[PDB]
Amino acid sequence: AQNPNCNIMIFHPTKEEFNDFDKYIAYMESQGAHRAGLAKIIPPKEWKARETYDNISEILIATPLQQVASGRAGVFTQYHKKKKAMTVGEYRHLANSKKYQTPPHQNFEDLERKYWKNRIYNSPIYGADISGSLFDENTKQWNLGHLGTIQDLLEKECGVVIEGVNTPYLYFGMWKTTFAWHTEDMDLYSINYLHLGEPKTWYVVPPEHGQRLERLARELFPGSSRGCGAFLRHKVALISPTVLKENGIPFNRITQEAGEFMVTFPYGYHAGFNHGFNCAEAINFATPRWIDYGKMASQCSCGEARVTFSMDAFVRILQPERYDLWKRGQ
Ligand SMILES: [NH3+]NC(=O)CCc1nn[nH]n1
Ligand SMILES: [Cl-]
Ligand code: NA
Ligand code: NI
Numbered sequence: 001a002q003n004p005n006c007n008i009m010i011f012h013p014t015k016e017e018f019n020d021f022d023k024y025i026a027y028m029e030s031q032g033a034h035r036a037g038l039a040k041i042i043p044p045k046e047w048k049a050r051e052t053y054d055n056i057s058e059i060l061i062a063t064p065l066q067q068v069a070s071g072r073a074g075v076f077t078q079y080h081k082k083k084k085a086m087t088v089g090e091y092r093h094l095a096n097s098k099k100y101q102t103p104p105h106q107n108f109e110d111l112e113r114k115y116w117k118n119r120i121y122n123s124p125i126y127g128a129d130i131s132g133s134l135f136d137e138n139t140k141q142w143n144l145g146h147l148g149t150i151q152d153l154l155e156k157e158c159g160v161v162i163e164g165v166n167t168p169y170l171y172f173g174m175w176k177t178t179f180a181w182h183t184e185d186m187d188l189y190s191i192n193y194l195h196l197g198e199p200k201t202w203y204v205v206p207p208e209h210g211q212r213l214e215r216l217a218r219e220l221f222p223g224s225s226r227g228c229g230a231f232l233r234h235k236v237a238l239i240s241p242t243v244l245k246e247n248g249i250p251f252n253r254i255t256q257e258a259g260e261f262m263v264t265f266p267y268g269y270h271a272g273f274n275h276g277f278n279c280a281e282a283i284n285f286a287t288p289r290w291i292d293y294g295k296m297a298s299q300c301s302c303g304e305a306r307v308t309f310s311m312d313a314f315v316r317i318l319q320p321e322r323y324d325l326w327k328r329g330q
């Protein structure tokens with residue numbers, strides 16, 4: 001078996017290899033990449049997402065989110081306080097202000113150390129889940145707005161025709177902006193392109209070990225676990241690498257830089273943080289291998305994890321027994 005230690009693999013496709021998206025995902029899996037739960041893909045030198053980022057400042061962040069932490073440095077939750085709208089230009093200025101800018105640091109490891117030491121003591125502001133795309137329409141390879149849809153995948157594999165769409169999201173981050181531990185809706189894949197700016201550090205648990213992370217999370221967040229048997233899909237809980245190591249949880253870490261893609265695989269728990277101002281684009285997708293995962297995916301029915309109406313069909317078809325309960329939750 002390939003990649004038995006579940007290491008994060010890094011791929012360097014040639015321009016020819018970059019033509020057929022599906023084929024390359026399948027290739028990465030043939031090499032065991034999925035075992036890690038996350039892979040990095042560095043595009044060929046001839047590729048670009050768009051010509052420049054000079055003209056993005058007028059994008060609106062309709063509901064910036066202030067990420068207010070509670071707990072202890074290595075075990076905390078975050079809640080998202082809504083703020084007044086602002087443009088990307090305004091957000092960038094805020095990120096670079098003395099209150100929010102990245103501190104002086106020696107390297108990525110020193111910054112990681114500062115993050116886990118001090119994150120709770122600050123409340124960075126996050127632009128999240130903004131429908132849109134920054135890929136040029138003429139970019140034919142790895143254009144996250146032009147992928148095959150999950151609905152079409154489900155139709156091709158299972159013969160059922162369903163409603164719903166599948167479009168990308170933009171994320172605008174600053175120092176200490178945090179994404180909590182989670183797997184995707186219905187344990188889908190995700191793909192993530194860092195368009196512009198400072199790095200984004202990722203942590204990931206191998207899919208074969210995701211239940212170990214869940215068990216730890218129930219111990220560390222006991223009231224949340226009593227409230228919902230799938231509370232990680234609320235996307236609020238953070239656990240540091242130090243705490244994961246103390247508890248024997250298998251995981252890996254890697255830093256993504258501008259111009260790089262990250263793929264998360266079905267049931268690969270991930271979390272991470274931004275180093276400074278940046279802009280990313282992401283979308284969920286499926287392959288034939290996902291179907292099994294979608295059938296088995298846990299669900300939040302407590303009401304906290306509201307999601308896209310696209311999800312309805314996925315639950316309805318893949319998990320008919322669970323559908324009426326999940327729907328009440330929505
Ligand atoms: N699936 N992709 C993710 O969970 C990353 C979400 C994110 N990327 N930048 N800010 N938030
Ligand atoms: Cl700091
Ligand atoms: Na490892
Ligand atoms: Ni995710």
Ligand SMILES: [Zn+2]
Pocket residue numbers: 227228229230231234300301302303304305
């Ligand atoms: Zn819930």
